Curated annotation (Swiss-Prot):
Substitution effect: residue 188 to A: Loss of activity
This enzyme's EC code(s): 3.2.1.125, 2.4.1.219
Gene name in the database record: RG
Protein name: Raucaffricine-O-beta-D-glucosidase
Site positions for Controls the gate shape and acceptance of substrates: 348
Length: 469
C-alpha cells in the first residue's frame, strides 16, 4: 500500500526535498542588477510561443518573497531544497567583463543563509536554461565552444561565493530538454529549428553542454572540493520507454534506442567518454567527436546523478535531417485502446508510477552510477479557473501520484539502486515555460490574483506529516 509510505520506510539519512528554477519563480527580471536571459527575450519578442502570452518578469516573485518561501519550507519540514542560480543575475553580461553583480550574489547568500538557519540543505543548479542573452548574442550561447570557458568562470564565481555553505551542486538541469526543445522543435528559448537546423544544432548544443559540464566538474574537483568538501553532479531528463509488444525483438531494440537518444546521449559520455553506439550509427557524421582529452575529462565526471521523471511511453520502430527523426522510433500511448497511464492536467503526462522504478533500475544497470537522487518528480493539476481555494488545494491526484512514485523509488532501492534522496517538483506553482502559468505543479498553491499568495495543498501537508524530521 503506497498511501502508507513514509520516512520510516527509508534510511535515516535519506534526503527529502522540493524544487524550483530561477526563471520559473524569481521574478525581479530587471531588479537588483539582473541582466536578461534568452527566456526573457523569447517570452518578450515571441509571446505567441507562450500559452497566454505571459513571461517571467515577475513569475511568483520569489526574488522579493524569499523569506516567505523559506518560512513555507520550514513549515513543510523536508531536509533539502533544490533551486538554481540565474547566471545573468550574478553576471549580467554572462562573461566576467560584462560585470559582477554584487546584489545578485547577496540575494543567493540571503537565500542560502535563511535555508541553513532553518536546517534545510541547499541543492544548487548552476544552469537551468536561462542563458545570458549577452552570450547568446555575442557568439550563439551553447552553439559555440566559447560557452565552455564562460560557464567555467561562472561556476567558479558560484563555488567561491557560496561553496562554503552549498555542499551539493549540479552543473546542468535537463540539458536534453534544453537542447531538444530549443534547437530541434524550436518551442523553447532560443526558439530554433522549427536560422536553425534541427539536424545539426541539437548535437552541437548537447556537445557543448557536455563539455561545459565536464570542465565545471574538473574545476570543482581540482580547485574547490578539498577546501569545501561538497559534491557535484548533474540532473537528467528521463521518461520510461517500454516495448509496445513485449515479444517483439524490434520493439525491445526501439525502446532501448529511445533510452539511448534521451538519457544515453548524456549518460554514456560521462560513463565511457563517448556517445551511445546507436546514436553513432543513426546520426553518423552529424554527431561530433570527443578528443581523447575530452573523453578523459567526461568519464566519471560526477559525484552523483539526479534523475528527473514524469511519465512513460510505449515504443516501436519508425516506418531532410532532424534529431526527432534520427531516433527512428514511433511513440505509442495505448495497447489495444488501454493507455499506459491516465492523463494529469497535461495530455503528454501519463501517470505510470512503475516507470520511475524501471528508470532507476535501468540507470544502475547500464551506467553503474554509485549515487543517484531523484531530482524531480511531480504532476500538474487539471486546468480550472472556477475553483475556490478550498477546492483547488485538495490535490488528490498529486497526493496519490507522489505516494505511488515514492513507493516505486523505495522498490528500486530494494532492487539495489543506491538512491540518496528524492525531490518533488515543484514547491510552488510557477511559470511552466511554453505553457505559462495555467499548468500548476506546486505542492504549494499560488494565487495569481493576489500578489502570488502561497497556500499549502494537501500534498504539502502529507509530505510534512509523513517525512518531517
Ligand atoms: O516540465 C516539468 C519540469 C519543468 O517545470 C522544469 O523546469 C523541468 O526540469 C521539468 N521538465 C519536464 C520534462 C521536459 C520535456 C518533456 C516533458 C517533461
Amino acid at each position: 500500500d503506497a498511501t502508507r509510505i513514509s520516512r520510516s520506510d527509508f534510511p535515516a539519512d535519506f534526503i527529502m526535498g522540493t524544487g524550483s528554477s530561477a526563471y520559473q519563480i524569481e521574478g525581479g527580471a530587471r531588479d537588483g542588477g539582473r541582466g536578461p536571459s534568452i527566456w526573457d527575450t523569447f517570452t518578450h519578442r515571441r509571446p505567441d510561443m507562450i500559452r497566454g502570452g505571459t513571461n517571467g518578469d515577475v513569475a511568483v516573485d520569489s526574488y522579493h518573497l524569499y523569506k516567505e518561501d523559506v518560512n513555507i519550507l520550514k513549515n513543510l519540514g523536508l531536509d533539502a531544497y533544490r533551486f538554481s542560480i540565474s547566471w545573468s543575475r550574478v553576471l549580467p553580461g554572462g562573461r566576467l567583463s560584462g560585470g559582477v553583480n554584487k546584489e545578485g550574489i547577496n540575494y543567493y547568500n540571503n537565500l542560502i543563509d535563511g535555508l541553513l538557519a532553518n536546517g534545510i540543505k541547499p541543492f544548487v543548479t548552476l544552469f537551468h536554461w536561462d542563458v545570458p542573452q549577452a552570450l547568446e548574442d555575442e557568439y550563439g550561447g551553447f552553439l559555440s565552444p566559447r560557452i565552455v570557458d564562460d560557464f567555467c568562470e561562472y561556476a567558479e564565481l558560484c563555488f567561491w561565493e557560496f561553496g562554503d555553505r552549498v555542499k551539493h551542486w549540479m552543473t546542468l538541469n535537463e540539458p536534453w530538454t534544453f537542447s531538444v526543445h530549443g534547437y530541434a522543435t524550436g518551442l523553447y528559448a532560443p526558439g530554433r529549428g522549427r536560422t536553425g537546423n534541427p539536424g545539426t544544432e541539437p548535437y552541437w548544443v548537447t556537445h557543448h553542454l557536455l563539455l561545459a559540464h565536464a570542465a565545471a566538474v574538473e574545476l570543482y574537483k581540482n580547485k574547490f572540493q578539498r577546501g569545501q568538501e561538497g559534491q557535484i553532479g548533474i540532473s537528467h531528463a528521463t521518461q520510461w520507454m517500454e516495448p509496445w509488444d513485449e515479444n517483439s525483438a524490434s520493439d525491445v531494440e526501439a525502446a532501448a534506442r529511445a533510452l539511448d537518444f534521451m538519457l544515453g546521449w548524456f549518460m554514456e559520455p560521462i560513463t565511457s567518454g563517448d556517445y551511445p553506439k546507436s546514436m553513432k550509427k543513426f546520426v553518423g557524421s552529424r554527431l561530433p567527436k570527443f578528443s581523447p582529452e575530452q573523453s578523459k575529462m567526461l568519464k566519471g565526471s560526477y559525484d552523483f546523478v539526479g534523475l528527473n521523471y514524469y511519465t512513460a511511453s510505449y515504443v516501436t520502430n519508425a516506418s531532410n535531417f532532424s534529431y526527432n527523426t534520427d531516433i527512428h522510433v514511433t511513440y505509442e500511448t495505448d495497447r489495444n485502446g488501454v493507455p499506459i497511464g491516465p492523463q494529469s492536467g497535461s495530455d503528454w503526462l501519463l501517470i505510470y508510477p512503475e516507470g520511475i522504478r524501471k528508470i532507476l533500475v535501468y540507470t544502475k544497470k547500464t551506467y553503474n552510477v554509485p549515487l543517484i537522487y531523484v531530482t524531480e518528480n511531480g504532476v500538474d493539476d487539471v486546468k480550472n479557473t472556477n475553483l475556490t481555494l478550498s477546492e483547488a488545494r485538495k490535490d488528490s491526484m498529486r497526493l496519490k501520484y507522489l505516494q505511488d512514485h515514492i513507493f516505486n523509488v523505495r522498490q528500486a532501492m530494494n532492487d539495489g539502486v543506491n538512491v540518496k534522496g528524492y525531490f518533488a517538483w515543484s514547491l510552488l506553482d510557477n511559470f511552466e515555460w511554453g505553457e505559462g502559468y495555467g499548468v500548476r505543479f506546486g505542492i504549494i498553491h499560488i494565487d495569481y490574483n493576489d500578489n502570488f499568495a502561497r497556500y499549502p495543498k494537501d500534498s504539502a501537508v502529507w509530505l510534512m506529516n509523513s517525512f518531517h524530521k
